[PDB]
Ligand binder design. Structure first.
Ligand SMILES: O=[N+]([O-])c1ccc(O[C@@H]2O[C@H](CO)[C@@H](O)[C@H](O)[C@H]2O)cc1
Length: 472
């Protein structure tokens, strides 16, 4: 039983628009911040790669559905490109080609018995909105509501699972370095917090919009996807345990405390540590923005489920490091990884499957056991179809999740493997492979070929159990 999926549990796979679509300027699509980064700053990206073509899923979406059907996916999580739909960012112009494209994908999925799950924002902000300052500018919350309205209006009759944002903890970091994630702005400890504040407001506006204008007719669910790693105490001391709690609150709690708790607002430790550090450095005002009481009440409770992106673990010890100012320095934890942990093709990604069970329990206890949908979990290598490391990664993480469900009572309701195909991997270009299907980026037809992990995942999805050969 601990190896069997609950009957209603949803299994599938996931992708993101800029990572797969290509067709970056085709049929009316406007430019986004990743078009800008890869065109203007190829020195930031491995091999100077771009997402101009990527997997060419704009043209090859029927092939993507074919492989999802082969895999036996029940749900396909994909994201919508904001600038493909609203090329100017604002809602004055709706690109019919964009509407037709996503309807064509949704309809193809449904005709093949696969449920669509749509992420509204996976990092590809229209450049016209970045030119106003992007996420640090609170005006983007209303622009995000207007974008969501166009999505609910056009697609909500058929789409019943929505995520507003994918991993703002990472995308806010685009405002904390001059050479990093788009838009590559160096405002650490200041602009990244402003970006977080806008995203939280935007998410809350989108959820209220669904309640007011769409839920009664459409009957779907709206969540948000938050990335978090497990943080294990470097030693068993109370002080190192405190540092791990700081990590959880500064990385997951930053977004989840305002939305998923009864109290709302940012975590106290976040408010308090940033206030103290700002005062010690001579600022008149805290670097952390504030919510009014009315805003706290508006934002809290804006969820039907919690999306979790989980990849790895860290060790945390008591102390402070990082540059002043920065979110890492403010967080009051020294983070490392254990050299014993198995490695991947990504410097930051170590294989620590027991950390997934620990994290699921931390979430259960902090947020009163919300329904959790694992929206990303996966592994990198440099290439190859006989992807034993990826197979092991998936089987171990699924086993740990199933223990969380069955033994620990955690309400996990679905899981989409990251990712369906090898991707444009952001600053890593085409150098790192996260797919369960390989794609030949040198072949204009971009054929998709199953790896061993795709065959194992199909076996899991078909049998609804972890096969005996992978059990302890
Ligand atoms: O803190 N971490 O461990 C972490 C943060 C952000 C992450 O981001 C993920 O990274 C994947 C692999 O590159 C991308 O394909 C995917 O688009 C992205 O959501 C993944 C992991």
């Amino acid at each position: 039983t601990v190896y069997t999926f609950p009957d209603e549990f949803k299994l599938g796979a996931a992708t993101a628009s800029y990572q797969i679509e290509g067709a970056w300027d085709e049929n009316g699509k406007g430019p986004n911040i990743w078009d800008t980064l890869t065109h203007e700053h190829p020195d930031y990206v491995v091999d100077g790669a771009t997402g101009d073509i990527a997997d060419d899923s704009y043209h090859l979406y029927k092939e993507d559905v074919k492989i999802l059907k082969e895999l036996g996916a029940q749900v396909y999580r994909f994201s919508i490109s904001w600038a493909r739909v609203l090329p100017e960012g604002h809602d004055n112009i709706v690109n019919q080609d964009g509407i037709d494209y996503y309807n064509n994908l949704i309809n193809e999925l449904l005709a093949n018995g696969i449920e669509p799950m749509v992420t509204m924002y996976h990092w590809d902000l229209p450049q016209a909105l970045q030119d106003l300052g992007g996420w640090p500018n609170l005006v983007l919350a209303k622009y995000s509501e207007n974008y969501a309205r166009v999505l609910f209006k056009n697609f909500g009759d058929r789409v019943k699972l929505w995520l507003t944002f994918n991993d703002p903890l990472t995308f806010m970091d685009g405002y904390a370095s001059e050479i990093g994630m788009a838009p590559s702005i160096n405002t650490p400890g200041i602009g990244d917090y402003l970006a977080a504040h806008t995203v939280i407001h935007a998410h809350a506006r989108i959820y209220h919009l669904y309640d007011q204008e769409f839920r009664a007719e459409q009957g779907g669910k709206v969540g948000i996807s938050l990335n978090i790693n497990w943080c294990e105490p470097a030693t068993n001391s109370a002080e190192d345990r405190a540092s791990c709690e700081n990590y959880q609150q500064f990385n997951l709690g930053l977004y989840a405390h305002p939305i998923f708790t009864e109290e709302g607002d940012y975590p106290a430790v976040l408010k308090d540590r940033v206030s103290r550090n700002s005062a010690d450095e001579g600022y008149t005002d805290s670097r952390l923005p504030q919510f009014t009481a009315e805003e706290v009440e508006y934002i809290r409770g804006t969820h039907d489920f919690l999306g979790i992106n989980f990849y790895t673990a860290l060790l945390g010890k008591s102390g402070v490091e990082g540059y002043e100012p920065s979110r890492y320095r403010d967080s009051g934890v020294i983070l490392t990884q254990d050299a014993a942990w198995p490695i991947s093709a990504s410097s930051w990604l170590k294989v620590v499957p027991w950390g997934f069970r620990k994290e699921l329990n931390w979430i259960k206890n902090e947020y009163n056991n919300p329904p959790v949908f694992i929206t990303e979990n996966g592994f990198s290598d440099y290439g190859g179809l006989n992807d034993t490391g990826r197979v092991h990664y998936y089987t171990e993480h699924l086993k740990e999740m199933l223990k969380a469900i069955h033994e620990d009572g955690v309400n996990v309701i679905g899981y989409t493997a990251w990712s369906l195909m090898d991707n444009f991997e952001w600053l890593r270009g085409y150098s790192e492979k996260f797919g369960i299907y390989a794609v030949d980026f040198e072949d204009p037809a971009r054929p998709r070929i199953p790896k061993e992990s795709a065959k194992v995942l199909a076996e899991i999805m078909n049998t609804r159990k972890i096969p005996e050969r992978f059990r302890d």
